[PDB]
């Protein structure tokens, strides 16, 4: 008899064969259904209850009965055809961990983590083919996230040698949940999980959590910040995450790939803040194509070519959109670019030639050269975010924003139509180092939360 053997295993809390994955434990499952097949669905549940050594907990019993149902009804040929069983079970499993002193929790948590990975993958897969399966968009991952969020809620800190199982998995849960949130179209909901994270954690310092979990967390948080255009906040996190990844001596492919994943966002973010990357160190995680690309962009920004930046963003539009990088760059790069453009002009015009005041017409022409043709100009066939935003004519405006952003020290006179700068030989007095200024104007939160 298989049923009773299992029920015994479970009762005692071994949980060796309590799994949905049919790679391992497939044979037992195959056997159970048939013994199970004869039995009525209603009959089996009492069966579970009537079994000896069974904890006096409604939830545990419900969970066991659920698993039996799964074993009885499961169709190996299709995970979809038996999704209901799977999800119902998983639900039951997870809400067996709510009660902090629930039966076998400690031996149950490890089961939950392993099954979670399985159910997420399944949910993900299913959602991707929702159109074909005639299922709602993100229907399953959503359900999962709800379940996990309830679990997340259930967690609270209250010898001092060993941490409870729930506490140990808390960070893992956070990252899982957040990843799901990003996977679903709406990642705003992360904010709730973040702010409630610390309150839920027993551990004194963030350092006490596993390094990989730390890195993923930082990655996600950074992405979250960037979603809200809070560039600096994102940058610190990215940089912290990549450093942490670097110092990790182990070089598995996963490691390097994740490193790349971070780099993808870090490279752009830094550029906005006026930070450039030494490629040598990043050579192992990035293809030459990537480097070259980001490089051409770097050139564009550095030498003050707006049209370049536009065309660059244009070429990489779709990919950039895929990461929510298009808009932020589109909006935030032009000023760094303008700074360099003006800085170049100023250095030659004033420091080299000792000209204190520059007429608007001059900057106008320079801006023409830098910006290229506008949608209003001849040979244009369309209005776009690449030919609509920037115009050569608005000299004063660009000067003004440059000044207000603290990237340029000057005074403009609308009536005179000329800008004025401090008569000096040192360029950095008139056009300070960009990163320091930007960061000064926009400081970040604490680098390590604990």
């Amino acid at each position: 008899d298989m049923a009773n053997q299992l029920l015994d295993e479970l009762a005692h809390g071994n949980f060796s064969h309590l799994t949905l994955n049919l790679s391992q434990n497939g044979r037992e499952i195959a056997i159970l259904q048939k013994q199970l097949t004869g039995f009525d669905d209603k009959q089996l549940e009492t069966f579970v209850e009537q079994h000896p050594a069974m904890p006096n907990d409604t939830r545990f019993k419900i969970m066991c009965t659920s698993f039996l149902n799964y074993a009885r009804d499961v169709d190996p040929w299709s995970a979809w055809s038996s999704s209901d069983l799977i999800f119902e079970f998983y639900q039951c499993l997870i809400n067996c961990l709510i009660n902090d002193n629930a039966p076998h929790i400690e031996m149950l948590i490890p089961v939950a983590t392993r099954e979670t990975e399985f159910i997420i993958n399944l949910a993900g897969k299913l959602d991707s083919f929702h159109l074909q399966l005639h299922t709602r968009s993100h229907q399953f991952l959503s359900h999962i996230s709800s379940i996990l969020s309830r679990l997340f809620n259930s967690i609270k800190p209250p010898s001092s040698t060993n941490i409870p199982g729930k506490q140990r998995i808390l960070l893992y849960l956070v990252n899982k949940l957040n990843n799901i949130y990003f996977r679903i179209e709406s990642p705003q909901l992360c904010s709730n999980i973040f702010k409630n994270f610390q309150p839920k954690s027993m551990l004194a310092h963030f350092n006490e959590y596993q390094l990989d979990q730390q890195i993923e967390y930082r990655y996600l948080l950074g992405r979250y910040y960037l979603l809200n255009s809070q560039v600096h906040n994102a940058f610190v996190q990215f940089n912290e995450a990549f450093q942490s990844l670097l110092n990790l001596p182990l070089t598995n492919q996963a490691i390097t790939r994740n490193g790349t994943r971070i780099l993808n966002y870090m490279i752009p973010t830094g550029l906005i803040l006026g930070k450039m990357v030494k490629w040598g160190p990043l050579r192992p995680f990035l293809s030459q194509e990537t480097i070259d690309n980001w490089s051409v962009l770097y050139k564009h920004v550095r030498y003050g070519n707006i049209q370049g930046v536009s065309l660059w963003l244009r070429q990489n539009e779709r990919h950039l959109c895929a990461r929510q990088l298009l808009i932020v760059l589109l909006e935030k790069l032009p000023m760094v670019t303008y700074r360099n453009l003006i800085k170049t002009v100023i250095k030659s015009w004033t420091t080299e030639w000792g000209q204190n005041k520059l007429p608007y017409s001059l900057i106008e022409r320079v801006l023409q050269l830098s910006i290229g043709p506008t949608f209003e100009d001849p040979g244009a066939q369309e209005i776009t975010i690449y030919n609509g935003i920037h115009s050569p004519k608005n000299v004063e405006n660009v000067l003004v924003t440059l000044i207000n952003l603290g990237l340029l020290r000057a005074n403009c006179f609308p009536q005179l139509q000329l800008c004025v700068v401090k008569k000096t030989t040192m360029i950095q007095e008139i056009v300070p180092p960009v990163n320091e200024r930007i960061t000064k104007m926009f400081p970040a939160h604490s680098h390590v939360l604990w």
């Binding site: 179209e185 993923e216 003050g304 017409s361």
Partner: protein, 56 residues
């Protein structure tokens, strides 16, 4: 043509296998200070020259 939504699945971190020499600099200290020959820059300078010459 296609009507599919845009999102990057690849962005999600791979699996955790885990179970302080962190002082590596990855940013160019002074991009700004460094000066190198470039066509665009020279073009700008050329324009500056033209403007200057044009108004005397």
């Amino acid at each position: 043509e296609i009507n599919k939504k845009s999102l990057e699945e690849d962005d999600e971190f791979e699996d955790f296998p885990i179970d302080a020499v962190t002082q590596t600099n990855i940013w160019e200290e002074n991009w700004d200070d460094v000066e190198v020959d470039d066509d665009f820059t020279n073009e700008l300078k050329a324009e500056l020259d033209r403007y200057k010459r044009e108004n005397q």
